[PDB]
Design a protein around this ligand. Sequence first.
Ligand code: HEM
Ligand code: HEM
Ligand code: HEM
Ligand code: HEM
Lengths: 146, 146, 141, 141
Amino acid sequence: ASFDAHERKFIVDLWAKVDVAQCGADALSRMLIVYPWKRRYFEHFGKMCNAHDILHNSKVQEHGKKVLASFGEAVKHLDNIKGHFANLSKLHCEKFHVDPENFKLLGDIIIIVLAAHHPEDFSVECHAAFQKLVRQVAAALAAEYH
Amino acid sequence: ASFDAHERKFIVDLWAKVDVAQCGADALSRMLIVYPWKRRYFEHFGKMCNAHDILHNSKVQEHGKKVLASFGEAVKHLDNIKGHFANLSKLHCEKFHVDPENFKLLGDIIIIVLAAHHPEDFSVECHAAFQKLVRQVAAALAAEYH
Amino acid sequence: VLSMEDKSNVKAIWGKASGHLEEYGAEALERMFCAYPQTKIYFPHFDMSHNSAQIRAHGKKVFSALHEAVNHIDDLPGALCRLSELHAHSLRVDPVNFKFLAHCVLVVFAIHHPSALSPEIHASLDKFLCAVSAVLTSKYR
Amino acid sequence: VLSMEDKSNVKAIWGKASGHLEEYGAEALERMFCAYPQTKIYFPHFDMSHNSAQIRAHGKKVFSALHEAVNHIDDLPGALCRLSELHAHSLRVDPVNFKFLAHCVLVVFAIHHPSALSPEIHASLDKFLCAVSAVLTSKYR
Ligand code: HEM
Ligand code: HEM
Ligand code: HEM
Ligand code: HEM
């Protein structure tokens, strides 16, 4: 569904406060720690035996910065999330072979990283707004799966 | 994705052979037996304590006929599955409150009922064609979920 | 399938919530109702206002149950037997709803204890909440 | 969580597949590769032609493993220990793939034994295949 004015406000005002490099590194590290099968999709980044190896992988830290920068482009295209994400959807499907159930697992890790960095801004209502965003973005990345 | 000519042929030629009343009754009964939480969505049909009660519920048998007749309208709108199913998607979301993960569970029961009624027609290739159809129909019924 | 280290991890993060079972439980429920409003069909009779008597009382029962689970983390099935009967057999709660509540429980620990919910700790707590959910959905019949 | 009746049901439908482990296993795999082609990334080295030596040999190992599971249906975790290590730890098979294979196993019994795979029997076999999948995904680390 469309975002209403109150949802848009929560999303836009919070995102302005987010350190996307730090949050992005954190979210990518946590998904590879919490859901270890996801390591198979990145076996070209090296060392991913254990959490210590993941937190000290410079390739994981940098890739996490680029995933969150890209997710944060949703916030400038709230109207057009599906259309904006279509090529990335295609690349995930065709080039990286990622199973689309995984997109919702990362959406939930991003909500946990935001909660832990901005605990006063992440009210009940704000979290509801972000949860809708993350669900739209996971669906847009799943959409070109054929 | 689009259906190719070979997929369309498998779908159209099999469906012409299907008894939709019998198959439909069977598929609905099996989902309420195999996934018992689904009984909560139909608690207005009566008696659904056990499998014997479900197989002897005239309301379950009749509703199963109408679900499979409706799914079989996909076969005449292979081009336009999402658009054709949009209102039903809305009714499921708004009126019946059905969780959209359940649509893929029924798609898989329908594949099992077709396999058991038409075992010679349900080749490896035919099953691949039907599996794509059932996945498109579950996605179209999930689409108006907002 | 919870390791010894997972168990020590869960016991330590859980210790933070001691003294706070009602408050943390009330919040986990308000977040579940607001972020996933389809879960409200299970609670027709509830005042859904913020800090309603009912939501606080239910938040407390939920978290007290989860606290007992931590104290019997080697026998979840026996510690959660009655509750599995209730959820799966009497309420017929659709299984996807246990993932939402589990997620909202993580968010509550991240807001209140962000430094304590490190990546390895998060991984343990998440394994415990999946284990709890799998017991509560194990009695559908 | 498999009842006594579930266990008797599984043992009886499984008896039908005896004498046919290679053939039924080969078919379950061909259906998985054709209906869910994303599963083929796990088998780069395989001739994917119909009835290839490799797919038959793998179909047999898979179904023989499932046959042992039926014969030790009271201790799935110990009967499937090594295989869980292999799938979860060494191959890192994404967990969604176990649902596909489980589904294709049901389709193979429906095609060959349609009258024997009644609604109650289907419900039992489906519970057994979920139980088997949950052991094989229990060792991700
Ligand atoms: C919010 C969800 C996601 C977003 C916005 C996202 C975005 C991106 C972006 C922007 C890239 C870079 C692509 C390029 O440079 O052309 C990428 C690459 C990749 N993503 Fe994702 N991604 C997401 C979720 C996931 C998930 C859940 C997985 C796997 C579990 C995954 C696996 C990959 C892989 C394997 C690559 C290629 C890795 C590399 O060589 O850099 N992504 N993704
Ligand atoms: C192929 C998937 C499905 C199709 C094509 C389908 C189709 C239909 C149709 C045609 C109706 C009749 C609606 C009307 O008369 O206006 C209906 C009603 C209903 N469906 Fe579905 N359905 C599907 C899946 C499901 C699933 C998975 C559930 C629940 C687990 C569900 C629950 C319901 C309920 C509760 C009703 C209303 C029952 C009644 O009073 O008749 N449906 N569906
Ligand atoms: C960690 C997961 C869960 C735990 C530990 C839990 C625990 C409990 C407990 C302790 C009770 C009260 C039982 C009693 O008073 O005898 C209860 C009741 C109930 N639970 Fe859950 N629950 C969980 C998840 C859920 C979920 C996901 C739903 C639905 C979305 C749900 C819906 C209910 C309902 C409707 C009741 C009855 C409420 C009432 O009668 O006022 N629970 N649960
Ligand atoms: C009922 C479920 C499953 C059973 C019982 C099973 C059983 C087995 C067995 C017995 C082996 C051979 C182990 C050995 O030779 O030591 C094996 C290997 C393997 N399995 Fe599975 N498996 C299952 C599901 C899957 C799924 C869902 C996937 C991927 C989609 C998968 C991918 C593999 C691969 C890639 C190998 C190695 C194949 C090879 O090296 O040639 N398995 N499995």
